[PDB]
Amino acid sequence: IESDLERAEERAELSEGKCAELEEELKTVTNNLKSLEAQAEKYSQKEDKYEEEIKVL
Amino acid sequence: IESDLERAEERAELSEGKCAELEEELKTVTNNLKSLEAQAEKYSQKEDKYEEEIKVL
Predict the structure, then answer these.
(1) CB B5 within 8 Å of CB A1
(2) Which residues carry this modification: Phosphoserine (chains A, B)?
(3) Is residue B24 less than 8 Å (CB to CB) from chain A?
(4) DSSP character for B1?
(5) How far lies B8's CA from each of A21, A46, B13, in Å?
(6) Both ends of chain A: CA-CA distance in Å?
(7) Which of A9, A28, A52, B4 is the most buried (most CB within 10 A)?
(8) How far is B7 from A12, CA to CA, in rounded Å?
(9) Which stretches within chain A are classed as H helix?
(10) A32 to chain B: nearest residue by CA?
(11) How many CA atoms lie within 13 A of B37 on its CB side?
(12) SS3 for A40?
């Protein structure tokens, strides 16, 4: 039973490590998505401004 | 020892489930990020053309 307990412990440790890594990856990619969305909104506004400038000039 | 082993194995199962869910989230967010990268590239091309026309005018 002691050997069985050791095996269970090591499996749990590996699973937790993978979980932590996945958490970090998701955090990074979600931050990237947020930044890109803000940039896209600003770009739409800039595009409208540029079209207005084209018309007036 | 037997009780501790049972609890450890249950913990490992829970961690594995969490890892699977994290994998799903990561893949979904990755796809969304790629789509928005393409959108931003289109934004960049539009801005380039508008800038050129502004210069000409």
Answers:
(1) yes
(2) 3, 15, 35
(3) no
(4) -
(5) 21, 56, 9
(6) 84
(7) A9
(8) 10
(9) 2-56
(10) B33
(11) 8
(12) helix
